Amino acid sequence: GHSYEKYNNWETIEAWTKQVTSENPDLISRTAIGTTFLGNNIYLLKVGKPGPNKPAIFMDCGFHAREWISHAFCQWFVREAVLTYGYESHMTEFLNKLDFYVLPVLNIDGYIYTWTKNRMWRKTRSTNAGTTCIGTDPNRNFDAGWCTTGASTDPCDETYCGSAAESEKETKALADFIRNNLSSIKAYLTIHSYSQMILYPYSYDYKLPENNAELNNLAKAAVKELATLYGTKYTYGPGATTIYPAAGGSDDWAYDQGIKYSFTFELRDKGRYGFILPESQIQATCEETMLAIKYVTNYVLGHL
Ligand SMILES: NCCCCC[C@@H](CS)C(=O)O
Ligand SMILES: C[As](C)(=O)[O-]
Ligand SMILES: [Zn+2]
Ligand SMILES: [Zn+2]
Ligand SMILES: [Zn+2]
């Protein structure tokens, strides 16, 4: 049984993507952008009402297996969209004018592993040459200063950059989709946990983006908006100085593709439960995050 207020295993989320798409045909369509190392279909949900030349926002969750609240948020967003469409003026205008590509779980193999063998697994589950150690850090596997800093060359490490950029089937599929739909995608949003932060390019080097002032003010207003609900405190800024250097990020690569609005979200909390955030906090976490996400969405729509 699927529930937005609890963590659902992969068998359930997969079924959920098919059921939610069938229950909302005028608003949701589903497709597979590729398959994982273990051959699992990487599902993508296109949320929005059909229209001509609609701009789009790309959001993905579950890059890292153990960050369960991340997976739960993507589902929650879809929940909000279909529930409030028509009653809430902002969400209705968002879905009416632009499309939302929601990728529920990128690292499916890792997610499954966290449910069956190791709750704290982070990387993918592909193999590595010359060792029995498994996995690559998908957020260190993109072509952006790839493997130069804040990422390890040791395949037995949790931030292993992989054998080459896009060496992972999952990251290659994500990069390909965005590359194929670059002219329509105006914003890239990637959901993680935790440390409560809103980061923007870059993390692979200590440098700032062309529209630094704009992203900084947007991140600042988004954080302020999130705090309005429960007073949850978030920090924000360029990845390198706000959290730490970390080359190979999808947010940086996306931005370097030309997507001016690229943000990485580190959801609740600040370490009390860490990755094992209680299911009792799912509602509050997702509801406050919706405020930040919709604030960014509104800004994007208004500055096309
Ligand atoms: N593109 C890097 C953004 C800053 C780090 C995010 C963090 C999320 S867990 C990580 O993946 O280490
Ligand atoms: C505190 As962390 C490993 O979710 O960047
Ligand atoms: Zn993460
Ligand atoms: Zn994190
Ligand atoms: Zn709500």
Which structural domains are found in the chain, ordered by start? 1-304 (3.40.630.10)
Token pair listed for 27: 């608003």
Query: How many Cα atoms within 13 Å fall on the side-chain side of residue 184?
Result: 17
Which-ligand-closest: CA of 91?
A: 5
| Residue 251 near residue 296, CB atoms below 8 Å | no
- CA 41 from chain centre, in angstroms, equals 17
Largest alpha-carbon pair distance within the chain?
57
Helix axes 10-23, 68-84, angle to 10 degrees: 10
The residue annotated as part of the active site, out of 80, 168, 225, 266, is 266
**CA atoms of 119 and 59, how far apart (whole Å):** 24
**CA atoms of 70 and 64, how far apart (whole Å):** 9
Token pair listed for 16: 């959920």
**CA atoms of 206 and 80, how far apart (whole Å):** 37
The number of beta carbons lying within 10 Å of the beta carbon of residue 171 is 28
**CA atoms of 99 and 81, how far apart (whole Å):** 11
Place of tokens 């209705």: 92
Strand-by-strand arrangement of the 99-103 sheet: 28-35, 41-47, 99-103, 56-60, 185-193, 261-267, 197-200, 235-238
Mutate to test the pocket of ligand 2, among 193, 194, 285 (most ligand atoms within 8 A of CB): 194
PDB experimental method: X-ray
3-class DSSP state of 197: strand
**CA atoms of 99 and 209, how far apart (whole Å):** 25
The enclosing H or E element of 212 equals: helix 212-230
Residues 6+ away with beta carbon under 8 Å from 129: 163
3-class DSSP state of 217: helix
The amino acid sitting at 139 is N
The enclosing H or E element of 10 equals: helix 10-23
Place of tokens 């993508």: 44
Return the ligand 1 atom nearest residue 194 CA: 9
The amino acid sitting at 276 is I
Return the ligand 2 atom nearest residue 64 CA: 4
The verdict on whether residue 125 carries a ligand-binding annotation is no
Residues 6+ away with beta carbon under 8 Å from 158: 122, 123, 137, 152
The verdict on whether residue 122 carries a ligand-binding annotation is yes
Token pair listed for 219: 């991140």
Which-ligand-closest: CA of 110?
A: 3
Place of tokens 């390198």: 240
Return the ligand 2 atom nearest residue 275 CA: 4
The verdict on whether residue 79 carries a ligand-binding annotation is no
